[PDB]
């Protein structure tokens, strides 16, 4: 029933685990930001989300990948 | 398969916390309870006050039913999601839950007269909520995630309790000012205080029967019922009859 | 088969929630449930109320038909969608839900005239990935996702139920100020409470 | 710490039973309705 | 500034099994609690979490052998950010135990 | 059903759900304008009009681009 | 006979058939703001447009290469 | 729980920096805006004005440096 | 007592006892990490401690295929 | 006692390199923080910050070479 | 016991170069703020303010320009 | 003498192209420094110190593009 | 330290003996109080035997 998660799972999940909250700021800060998008509060407040956002995404990938070719190049040495 | 969870909580916390500073002369700084420089006009301090107190109690009960022969194997598995609606209703942002259980069995008959059945059980509510505000976690109700696999046997029409759990707490804590806190009519000025106490039950009890006669009303007649009184009936509709009356009966 | 699906909701909410600031000729400062001062002098505090009471009901029925031939297997399937236009008409968009069921079966003759079935069942709507809008929720009913898999025979022409589900909850909330929620004739203005309660069958 | 017993007899009051009084005193219960009777009774009943 | 603090945590799980039929528990829950300050916008949570692995024998002198394997806790988190929750909800060590015991 | 609307339509529709009428007004303040160019009270109407406007459509180009690049950064990793 | 497809084009297809119809809205607004070059409202439109519409060809083209690697791995093992 | 990153963390600091120029800048412009012609008042909100753009500008400015020098640390791990 | 052990095996440990504590030092670098994924003295740390741990893992199995190699082709003379 | 590898070693020549920057870095923008305006402040911030751009640049292209060097002869052994 | 880059030589080369101007400014517009309405005053400060103003310049864009070629020639190491 | 190689040879072409530039750029500063606002001083800096940048950066240039011809040689020695 | 002790018959005591002991060279000291405050000591590696 629950998801079978394997290796990689657990590292993404770590990255998932550790913004606790950012996943749902980003859009509160949106949606008050689109409501009056000229008061310099508001944006000072979501440029700081946005790139915070943008770097745990970048960082999650790229870690992933490494662990991919890791276990790609032993499990080549098997034959 | 009957589950059970039951939770009561109560919260209190109540006091102040108190800063500042002065500058004199403005050749002398002085501070008070600040991790911080002063800018040095002085004569500024803070009290900050709170006041606050909760009680929640909540209770959930579950029952699935699963029918299946003797030394065949079955699983039932179901899952379900609850929304919550927020003031400023018309802005789309639901909270939500999801409970999903599971259960997979193989039953066994004794010349005893007696059921043994091989279990294993999985329930709870999915671990990864995103509750940004406590609407959520006051609207819809925690549970755990719990597995349990095992044997057991019961007699012929009795009930057993396979597993469950119990949990209490209580916290006490207390601040104040040395001097201050022991003041004969003001002390209470400079004192923080906080208490919490949580209860939680949780269990899970079985109870197989043996199953020989068929269902009496029949189905259809049952349906027949719901459908009417429900208002949702709309077999009155002249075009759709041509073809009910194939389905409906023979 | 016969799929039945009831739905039955109560929910109130009621009352206030109070913060503030104080300030004394710029002597002392004094916040009230607020992190930060309005380096106001005991003047404009917050009040928030909240006052709202709903019911609903959702009744949903379904059967389908199945022909086949004895020792034959057989599959049906079906999928199909529904959809809803909102209230504030000039421009939302139309908000949907999909249903699917799928029926596999393998059917046996007995010799006292019974008739017993392979059977695997799985039916539902789907997962909404991540938000909807409150109205949504309000027309298109949910309804799980459910996957069972079992033998039966049955009397020719009776009826078994193979399995179902039900669920029942309550709660209940109320957060007060520690002096003043005490008080006879004002309490009521400084207690906040709320209530949940919920009951769903499903049977096949 | 640890402590282990042998189960020889179920459980009494009957789950049904313990069940039943948790709701009713929690108004949890809604067997009082009129439509879901229709089908509870196959679930409670047999 | 003069502080004291005091908490107390008990947790009893049960399980059902034969004799000579390795059996498993395990559970886990979070709590949360709310913060206040902040306009009361804060909330904390933490998860406690416990399994059991068991494997029961009986002795002729009615005495009862138990093969037994716990893990339990408090998941380790370095994130903590506040006093009050700290205050609030109780710290508990990550404890692993396998041992044979009648 | 509706025209089939992404992630990024649905964020750059925030921002034209967000400012209710905004579109409208600027026309209709042009409009007067036009009528009578020289009168103050018109005038400085329409400079705050147009001020919001420019700031609405340069922030909205502006998020949308960035949320390309963290989904192409993603999809590089695949292969 | 009906047009054979295997599982490589099977999985491609999943992407046409799950962009309902931005393969033609794209043709659409190219052909709007090309009749229209300076409205603002047309730019606004047609940026969000073809940036789905790139996103949407590098991760198909992208997956059908991870699985074709996959077959051509096993398919070296039958020696 | 309020979590914060690091950028969250150098943001904070010019907001804790700048105690109350937020409010003082607001009511500077509240009593301006009831006696438009007192020159006391005016001379107060040039210099409250000047001193909140330069505030919103270096703010800005270095939250941007400290995008790029740690997105050109992520790059690198392939 | 101990579990049988081969000469390949010998070879193996070897690494192992060698990097005495980089299978920790990886996981508690990496937690550090992902609670605050964007403090460059993280990253910079992580970078060093990954990169480490992908050259051991993959020298360890070369290495070992080698000594296969070399034992599978001396008992082939046995016959 | 800990272990540390080559790389690590390359990368702490650059930490001890720059002797105390971490700490001018941090002090000098509080310092900034708690008067946004002032010519001098300005100065030494854009100098600082500056500097530290450049040592963690230098820091991780650097330790990426090395590891390909190393990658490219264990790919050999095989 | 400080610590200084190639940028902060470059930087407290200017420093050094004009001995006194940055008290000079000061005491210069201490006593004018005496007495606004003294056109020796105003004479002397006019050319004070802009001796600052050019050297303030000439310094921040120097920086600049020596950032932007470092930052070009770590670029060709990876 | 040390080993140089190859690369090395051409890096160092540059240098003894420009002869005297690498000195001629730091008494233009020393000088500038002096008097700042100086325009005949500022017309003879600007100039100096664009040739430096336009060589630094050519020598970078040059120097990676032999690297990867060589790198793709070497190669195929395999 | 490491060890293996031998017991001989006159009741004397031969042991193998590996030893190592230091500073962790991670020079710290940019500041005069570093040195003044903590001593530095060799960092020393010895293996024998003796009885």
Redesign the interface.
Known sequence: ??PWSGYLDDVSAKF??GVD?L???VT?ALDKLAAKPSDPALLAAYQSKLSEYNLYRNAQSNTVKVFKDIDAAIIQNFR | L?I?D?NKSD????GTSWS?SITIGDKLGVSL?QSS?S?LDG???????????????????????????EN?P??????????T???G??????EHV?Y???IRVLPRFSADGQIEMSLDI?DGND??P?????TS???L???????????????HG?????????????????????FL?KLPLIGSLFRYS?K?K?N?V?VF?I?P?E?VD??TP???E??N???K??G?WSGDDKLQKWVRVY?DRG
Chains 1, 6, 7, 9 share one sequence.
């Not at chain 2, 079955?74 to 929304?83: L, M, P, S, V």
């Not at chain 2, 209703?89 to 639901?94: F, S």
């Not at chain 2, 696999?149 to 007699?155: E, H, K, N, Q, W």
């Open positions: 029933a629950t998932d685990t909250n996943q749902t700021q509160e | 009957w059970v039951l919260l209190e916390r109540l500042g309870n420089i800018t004569s500024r301090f803070i009290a900050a006050v709170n006041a606050l107190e909760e009680k929640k109690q909540a209770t959930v009960v579950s029952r699935p039913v699963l029918l299946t022969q065949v079955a699983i039932f598995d179901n899952n379900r999601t609850f929304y609606k927020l003031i209703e018309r802005n789309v942002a639901l999801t999903g259980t599971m999985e671990k990864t995103q509750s940004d505000t406590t976690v006051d609207a109700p925690e549970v755990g995630r719990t597995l349990i696999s095992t044997i057991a046997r019961v007699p009795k009930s057993l309790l396979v597993g469950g759990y119990t949990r209490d707490a209580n916290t006490d804590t207390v601040q104040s000012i040395p806190g906080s919490n949580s939680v949780r009890m109870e029967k199953i068929p269902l029949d189905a259809s049952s349906v019922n719901i459908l009184q429900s949702a389905l």
